[PDB]
């Protein structure tokens, strides 16, 4: 299935890192300290596609760990999910692992296919977790740049 390696940075130039075994944190990184930043494998999966909207999965480079969207206290929640490493990645990923990648003026948004109008968001502050957020509007950050890596 077509995959691209990539890092993500938020519109404020916070870089993404592994907090716990299962959280991402966003933080202002520079220098060699930049090593510490998480590389995704982004997969082109089966879904509703427009020029403007592309369904992707977001895995970590050589870990069987995928971002999924799941209900946790009657709230959409973002988690890192362990998968069977022989069975993944797939073209037909399960709906919780699917994001619509949306290009909206050199920036990306990642909408959950599973919770419409829920986006991968970061905090304005340092060292807070990446979350599923439902409110686009000058508060939490919902847009990203993408960098390719010579994988």
Swiss-Prot record:
Site keyed Important for interaction with integrin: positions: 53, 61, 63, 72, 86
Gene Ontology MF: a single term: interleukin-1 receptor binding
Assigned GO CC terms: cytosol; extracellular region; extracellular space; lysosome; secretory granule
Effect upon mutating residue 86 to E: Suppression of integrin binding. Markedly reduced activity. Markedly reduced activity
Consequence recorded when altering residue 63 to E: Suppression of integrin binding. Markedly reduced activity
Record-level GO BP terms: apoptotic process; astrocyte activation; cell-cell signaling; cellular response to interleukin-17; cellular response to lipopolysaccharide; cellular response to mechanical stimulus; cellular response to xenobiotic stimulus; cytokine-mediated signaling pathway
Location of this chain's protein in the cell: Cytoplasm, Cytosol; Secreted; Lysosome; Secreted, Extracellular exosome
Induction comment from the UniProt entry of this chain: By LPS. Transcription and translation induced by M.tuberculosis and a number of different M.tuberculosis components in macrophages; EsxA is the most potent activator tested (at protein level). In pancreatic islets, release is increased by high glucose treatment. In pancreatic islets and macrophages, release is also increased by endocannabinoid anandamide/AEA.
Keywords: Cytokine, Cytoplasm, Inflammatory response, Lysosome, Mitogen, Pyrogen, Secreted
Motif (Involved in interaction with TMED10 C-terminus): 110-123
Site, Involved in receptor binding: residue positions: 2
Consequence of substituting residue 72 to E: Suppression of integrin binding. Markedly reduced activity. Markedly reduced activity
Tissues showing expression: Expressed in activated monocytes/macrophages (at protein level).
Record note on modification: Activation of the IL1B precursor involves a CASP1-catalyzed proteolytic cleavage. Processing and secretion are temporarily associated.
Regulation: (Microbial infection) Cleavage by S.pyogenes cysteine protease SpeB promotes its activation independently of CASP1. SpeB-mediated maturation of IL1B plays a dual role depending on infection site: while IL1B inflammatory response prevents bacterial growth during invasive skin infections, it promotes streptococcal infection of the nasopharynx by disrupting colonization resistance mediated by the microbiota.
Family: Belongs to the IL-1 family.
Function of the molecule: Potent pro-inflammatory cytokine. Initially discovered as the major endogenous pyrogen, induces prostaglandin synthesis, neutrophil influx and activation, T-cell activation and cytokine production, B-cell activation and antibody production, and fibroblast proliferation and collagen production. Promotes Th17 differentiation of T-cells. Synergizes with IL12/interleukin-12 to induce IFNG synthesis from T-helper 1 (Th1) cells. Plays a role in angiogenesis by inducing VEGF production synergistically with TNF and IL6.
Note: The IL1B production occurs in 2 steps, each being controlled by different stimuli. First, inflammatory signals, such as LPS, stimulate the synthesis and promote the accumulation of cytosolic stores of pro-IL1B (priming). Then additional signals are required for inflammasome assembly, leading to CASP1 activation, pro-IL1B processing and eventually secretion of the active cytokine. IL1B processing and secretion are temporarily associated.
Assembly, per entry: Monomer. In its precursor form, weakly interacts with full-length MEFV; the mature cytokine does not interact at all. Interacts with integrins ITGAV:ITGBV and ITGA5:ITGB1; integrin-binding is required for IL1B signaling. Interacts with cargo receptor TMED10; the interaction is direct and is required for the secretion of IL1B mature form. Interacts with HSP90AB1; the interaction facilitates cargo translocation into the ERGIC. Interacts with HSP90B1; the interaction facilitates cargo translocation into the ERGIC.
Official protein name in the record: Interleukin-1 beta
Species: Homo sapiens
Upper taxonomic lineage: Eukaryota, Metazoa, Chordata, Craniata, Vertebrata
Designated gene of the protein: IL1B
Residues of the full protein shown: 119 to 269 of 269
């Amino acid at each position: 299935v077509r995959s691209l390696n990539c890092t993500l940075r938020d519109s404020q130039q916070k870089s993404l890192v592994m907090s716990g075994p299962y959280e991402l944190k966003a933080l202002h990184l520079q220098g060699q300290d930049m090593e510490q930043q998480v590389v995704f494998s982004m997969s082109f999966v089966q879904g509703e596609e427009s020029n403007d909207k592309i369904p992707v999965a977001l895995g970590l480079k050589e870990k069987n760990l995928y971002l999924s969207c799941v209900l946790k206290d009657d709230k959409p929640t973002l988690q890192l999910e362990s998968v069977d490493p022989k069975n993944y990645p797939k073209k037909k990923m399960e709906k919780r692992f699917v994001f619509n990648k949306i290009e909206i003026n050199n920036k990306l948004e990642f909408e959950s296919a599973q919770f419409p109008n829920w986006y991968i968001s970061t905090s304005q502050a340092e060292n807070m977790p990446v979350f599923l957020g439902g409110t686009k509007g000058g508060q939490d950050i919902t847009d990203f740049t993408m960098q390719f890596v010579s994988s």
